[PDB]
Amino acid sequence: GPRFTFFQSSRGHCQIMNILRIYYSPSIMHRYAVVQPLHIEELTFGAVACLGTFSATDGWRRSAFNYRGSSLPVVEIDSFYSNVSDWEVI
Amino acid sequence: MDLKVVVSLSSRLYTDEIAKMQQRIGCILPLASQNVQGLGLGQVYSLETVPDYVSMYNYLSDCTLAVLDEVSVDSLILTKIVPGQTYAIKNKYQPFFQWHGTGSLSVMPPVFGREHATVKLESNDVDIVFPMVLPTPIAEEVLQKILLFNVYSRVVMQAPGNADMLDVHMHLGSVSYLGHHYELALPEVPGPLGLALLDNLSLYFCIMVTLLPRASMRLVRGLIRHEHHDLLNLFQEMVPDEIARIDLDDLSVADDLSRMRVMMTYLQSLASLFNLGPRLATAAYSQETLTATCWLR
Amino acid sequence: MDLKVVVSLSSRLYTDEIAKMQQRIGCILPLAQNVQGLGLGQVYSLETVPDYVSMYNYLSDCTLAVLDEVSVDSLILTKIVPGQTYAIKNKYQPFFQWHGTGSLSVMPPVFGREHATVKLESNDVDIVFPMVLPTPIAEEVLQKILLFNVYSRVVMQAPGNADMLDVHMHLGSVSYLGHHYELALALLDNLSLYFCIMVTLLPRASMRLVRGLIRHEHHDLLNLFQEMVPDEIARIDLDDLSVADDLSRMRVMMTYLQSLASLFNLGPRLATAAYSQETLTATCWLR
Amino acid sequence: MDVHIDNQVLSGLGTPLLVHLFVPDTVMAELCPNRVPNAWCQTLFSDRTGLTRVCRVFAARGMLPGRPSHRGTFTSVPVYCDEGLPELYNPFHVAALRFYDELVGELQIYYLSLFEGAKRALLSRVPVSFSKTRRAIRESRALVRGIAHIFSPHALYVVTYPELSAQGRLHRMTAVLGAPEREFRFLISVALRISASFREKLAMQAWTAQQEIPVVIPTSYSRIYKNSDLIREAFFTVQTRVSWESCWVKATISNAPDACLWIDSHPLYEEGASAWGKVIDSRPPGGLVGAASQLVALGTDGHCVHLATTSDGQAFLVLPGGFVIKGQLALTPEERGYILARHGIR
């Protein structure tokens, strides 16, 4: 089943995808061993976009977003400068 | 908002180099965040390493650039690059490039030789080489030329009867400009990161060769069998065997749409790969005094 | 901060230019100021064929600007900074869509020459706006006109292998988010020329690069899993050809994929935030 | 098991048939020490010498066999020789490989040593690599067998397994001398004509040293070397058992890449297989003074006889003691073209 994930990066926007492929390569080595695409789609494996920037002077401080059921830790981003860019496939 | 970031040296800058740093005023230098080392490109491009122009490309693209405007002894003032401000940049680089095109600007590693961008600093244990500033079409042409050279010089070295080593160094060779041809600096081994870039490029290539729109094959066959175009000069009235053997099937339209869909998405991904290195949008480069208002795109 | 740029008209107008500019008071327009070098009237000129890729490069070259108000002698417009925001309305010859759409394109008008072109007889500038249209709409339209030009030129080439009805049922119709729009028709001839010579040199280039990069790494799991991918017939002929013409074909391959790579990026990528449907305007900022 | 499916799909242009191999790590240690290489196929003939087209072969080291009896690298031998029908075999037939990472070391292999071991062993779509599908299911021990290698008296391991009609027509193939003979006698012919050039150059001159290279020499040089003691110049011709590592042909292939030199070094009287074909530079800014320093260090090697070949058609012999005997190089361009085709491309 598909998934959404998040990436903090201190590098620039354009160079970040090539390092993401290097990180992401064991997730793509498991594909295509058991499946082979017909009806041709599926050659794309995920896509990345920019959410924006934030200040690295104050780092992310983990806090506790709790429901009444259980506990759930969360990464807090303070002084975020939001900028939605376009989808870039891998 | 602040732009003024002062950087101290650590020892007395000698008066022989204050003259040339007076000569290099308004140039661009890569930052580290202060300190003295790495404020420049000597730490990743030294004499010891073969210049791969890709790891230093990684460092200049990954780090925010900086303008050097004032040099004094034991203190020199820098100015960062933050998007939204229209920086004044002077083209002060010995391989000259007039910005008659007035296009978008591009920064590149010193591929035009070590001497043209270096400066010796006998005060401390730091030497500075400078990033090259050059327009968009020359930058992308020299980029594809240095990648094609580091991928084909190695296979020419792989040839046992390598009768022609100097064939690519004079055909590929210099750079394409109407004013002059300007010979560049050429590595012999591509380095690791260069082969990583060719690896991802060949990955995109072998993914995109699995889908070709078959109608276009018929068009280039018909135009070859029409008059030979000036754009068709690279064929010199010849049909390659491969396009003759991938046209055994007929012309369809159903697979053509999804073919073109994945081709748009992978060409935009390839453009995102080749829009690498920080870019400048130019408004009104003034010709008579060699200065340009530019902001970070 | 005042980003407003007045364009001084040479000749006095009359009421039709008023009615057409107030018909077109929302749409955007390029720049260099001067009245002549104002719009796409230096590239949509009828003294030549109005080409596509040079039009794209000229539009990406100069900055963009929105028109605000028209007087008898002045043409009040405001240009675009990537710092602050602006407003944008459609007021276009096709009234397609602004469906909350997080990305927007500015394409040159490929539907019709005079569909955007407000033609003025008092001054022969024949100003013409680029089409503002959202991004999947723009990609689908560019796909469906590129393949339309390939199919038209191949049925002009040989009328045996191509027809027109089964592609009019297929690629004359654009559809997006419950809206079904219609589009039909030598600039696209040059574009399809670039596209066809790209895909023609692509097998030789791809097989040369994979034979170059095939065994650098001596055991990678990714390398094998990407080299079992390609066509088994796309991997025969390299050493029959020499080095010089092959590398020239590589050079023209690379510069053409770079040019078309920026071209299949959708040009000046505007971005919308909140579209008010009852007002027909969107809040925009350059990105 | 990667390089076999690598070269199998690759060499379909210039080869109909492809044979897969192992190479142990002991059998090429005398070829190139310190694991300096990491190829190129050119199978010359036995009596139909001529010249043939070249084929590239890919390979890998450091990846271990499924046999733990020995642990070595991967190679593979293409076979494309037999005209029309491939059912005939050429017996007593060399097949040269140029294993390399940057052209050092050669690999001579037989068709008998290959095939006797081979018999002894036995909305659209993406298409799959077809030939890799049958190698994963084999995974067995009987596919690899031990072959007494003929050039070096060791074991060379082959791999083959019942793939398909190409390897199926291989194990039925048989058919009804001089493939190692011609290259050695060709070396002795060019060595005899060069020694004859030295003979006639010492004859037309006064039989005297010009001493082109400067060395100081002791007064007992006519004692610790005896009178007319050219017994090393005598048995020079037997000692050159190698040629394409030897500098003599290295100058002829260097014509395609002006002030260059290649030096062979043979010891004073059988100290061992010293070296063949080293480099004297003039291109980089080490310069002609560095060339002169390396040259006088060559000349002061008191227990090694050096032979110097130029690119422009001249041969030189260096006696230990700084004495130089001039000589010519002029050979018929048929042998020149045969040599540069034997290495690579004209």
Round the Cα radius of gyration of chain A to an integer and report it: 17 Å
Tell me the span between the first and last alpha carbons of chain A. 18 Å
Determine the number of helices of chain B (DSSP H or I, runs of at least 4 residues): 8
Q: Biggest interface, which chains? A: B-C, 70 and 70 residues
Order of helices and strands of chain A: HEEEEEE
Structural class computed from helices and strand pairing of chain A: alpha+beta
> What overall geometry of chain B do the principal axes of the alpha carbons give?
elongated
- Please state the oligomeric state of the protein chains shown: part of a larger assembly
Q: What share of the residues of chain B lie within helices?
A: 25-40%
Overall SS class of chain B:
alpha+beta
What order do the strands of the largest sheet of chain B run in, or round the barrel if closed?
Answer: 5-11-10-6-9
Estimated helix fraction of chain A: 10-25%
Q: Which strand-content bin applies to the residues of chain B?
A: 15-25%
Q: Mind summarizing the main beta sheet of chain B?
A: 5 strands, antiparallel
What's the gyration radius of chain B in Å?
23 Å
Distance between the termini of chain B: 19 Å
> What order do the strands of the largest sheet of chain A run in, or round the barrel if closed?
1-6
Brief summary:
Chain B: It comes from Epstein-Barr virus (strain B95-8). Chain A is of the alpha+beta class.
Report on this structure.
Chain C: Belongs to the herpesviridae TRX2 protein family. The structure is cut from a larger assembly and holds 1 copy of chain A (90 residues), 2 copies of chain B and 1 copy of chain D (346 residues). Chain A is α+β, with helices and mostly antiparallel strands and 90 residues long. Chain A has one helix at residues 16-28, and strands at residues 47-48, 52-54, 61-64, 73-76, 80-82, 88-89. In chain A, the strands form 3 sheets. In chain A, strands 1-6 form a two-stranded antiparallel ribbon. Chain A has a two-stranded antiparallel ribbon with strand order 2-5. Chain A has a two-stranded antiparallel ribbon with strand order 3-4. Chain A starts with 15 loop residues before the first helix and ends with a strand. Chain B is α+β, with helices and mostly antiparallel strands and 297 residues long. Chain D has helices at 3-10, 111-121, 135-138, 165-168, 181-204, 221-224, 231-234, 236-239, 247-253, 287-299, 333-343, and strands at 17-23, 40-42, 55-56, 73-79, 94-97, 107-110, 144-148, 155-159, 261-267, 275-280, 304-310, 314-318, 324-328. In chain D, strands 10-9-11-12-13 form a 5-stranded antiparallel beta sheet, with helices on both faces. In chain D, strands 4-1-8-7 form a 4-stranded antiparallel beta sheet, with helices on both faces. In chain D, strands 3-2-5-6 form a 4-stranded antiparallel beta sheet. Chain D starts with a helix and ends with a helix. Chains A and B meet through helix 1 and strand 6 of A and helix 2, helix 5 and helix 8 of B.
